[PDB]
From a paper:
Peptidoglycan amidases are key hydrolytic enzymes that are needed to break the peptidoglycan layer during cell division to allow for separation of daughter cells. The activators share a common motif, the LytM domain, which forms the proposed site of amidase binding and activation.
After extensive crystallization trials, we were ultimately successful in solving a crystal structure of the AmiB hydrolytic domain bound to the EnvC LytM domain using proteins from Citrobacter rodentium. First, the EnvC LytM domain is bound directly to the amidase interaction helix, with the latter’s hydrophobic residues all pointing directly into the LytM groove. Second, the amidase regulatory domain has a very different conformation in the EnvC-bound structure such that the interaction helix is contiguous with helix 5 and the blocking helix is displaced from the active site. Finally, the active-site zinc is ligated by three residues rather than the five due to the absence of the blocking helix glutamate (Glu167 in AmiA) and dissociation of one of the aspartates (Asp271 in AmiB, equivalent to Asp135 in AmiA). The extended loop wraps around the residues located between the interaction helix and helix 5, causing them to form a single, continuous, helical element. Inspecting the density surrounding the zinc, a low-occupancy ligand is present at the fourth position of the coordination sphere.
Numbering used by the authors:
A (entry chain B): 297 to 427
B (entry chain A): 190 to 288, 322 to 422
Write the structure that this text describes.
């Protein structure tokens, strides 16, 4: 019933380079609200903590996007995926693989769009990512 | 499977927009461009051009949305004329526009993000072409709200074709030729973008 406060507590959705970073200037006013992490076509995307899958749909730009509720209105988002490995309603425990990376928003290079929202509001995720 | 471009002739009927010192009226420019743009888009098999306003009447912000939605528009282009106090202020401009409850929001908040991006890229493209036929009063895309009301789903740009306040540009904006050139530009602008990022 909550991600709790950032403390390298949570699993890395996927491991690799941080291609784009929370806050990174995109263009004009627009600046990233997630991280783009590098990974191979079809690398297994793991759920950062314990929670329930509340969404798995295909969003223009962000490819197929899974979203996991952890409580409070703390949730994790995972986009650019080719395919999900769970269905809305499913319960997922941290570590559990929930998607497979693609370029499905990446466009240019296999990657994961990973975002955390706390009070449904997008924050820098990094401080949660521990081991 | 065609890309659907809503062309929104700014102002209309009751509201003339800005009127030049020579008495030419924003509304009668915007529509005259918008039709030339529809022609250039429907000419291109990649695109279908459709109008939010298709004659001289008033139509609310909302209504221009509801038309573009009811025409399943994939992207929207509003056409306007700028006008300043400073009568020698001239030049084209381009504007980029906007709009479990914690998921409810999150999805809109992503789509906002995409829209805003496509918008900006298209704006860039467009200015690109506009600066070939005129000068720009702003060479970067200016972010703003107002129109689009609440389309986080459909990206939109506003093209200030020039300053109808400026006795010179007024005459160009009343020029079939130059309206054509503006249409051509705004078109090439989209073409260049969607060419490179087709609807996949
Ligand atoms: Zn106007």
């Amino acid at each position: 019933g909550g991600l709790g406060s950032p403390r390298g507590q949570a699993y890395w959705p996927v491991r690799g380079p941080t291609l784009h970073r929370y806050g990174e200037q995109l263009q004009g006013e627009l600046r990233w609200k997630g991280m783009v992490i590098g990974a191979s076509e079809g690398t297994e995307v793991k759920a950062i903590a314990d929670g329930r899958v509340i969404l798995a749909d295909w969003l223009q730009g962000y490819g197929l996007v899974v979203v996991v509720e952890h409580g409070k209105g703390d949730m994790s988002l995972y986009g650019y995926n080719q395919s999900a490995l769970v269905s809305v309603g499913t319960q997922v425990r941290a570590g559990q693989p929930i998607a497979l990376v693609g370029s499905s928003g990446g466009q240019g290079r296999p990657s994961l769009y990973f975002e955390i929202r706390r009070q449904g509001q997008a924050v820098n995720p990094q401080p949660w990512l521990g081991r | 499977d065609k890309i659907v471009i809503a062309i929104d002739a700014g102002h209309g009927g009751q509201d003339p927009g800005a009127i030049g010192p020579g008495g030419t009226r924003e509304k009668n420019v915007t529509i005259a461009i918008a039709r030339k743009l529809r022609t250039l888009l429907n000419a291109d098999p990649m695109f279908k051009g459709v109008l939010t306003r298709d004659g001289d009447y008033f139509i609310s912000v909302m209504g221009r949305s509801d038309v573009a939605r009811k025409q399943n528009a994939n992207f929207l282009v509003s056409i306007h004329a700028d006008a300043a106090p400073n009568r020698s202020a001239t030049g084209a401009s381009v504007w980029v526009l906007s709009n479990d409850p914690y998921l409810s929001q999150a999805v809109l908040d992503l789509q906002f993000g995409h829209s805003q991006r496509v918008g900006y890229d298209v704006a860039t493209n467009m200015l690109g072409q506009l600066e070939r036929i005129g000068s720009l009063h702003k060479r970067r895309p200016e972010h703003a709200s107002l129109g689009v009301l609440r389309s986080p789903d459909i990206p939109s740009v506003l093209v200030e074709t020039g300053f109808i306040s400026n006795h010179g540009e007024e005459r160009l904006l009343a020029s079939d030729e130059y309206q054509q050139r503006l249409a051509e530009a705004i078109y090439q602008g989209l073409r260049n973008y969607f060419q490179a990022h087709p609807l996949q």
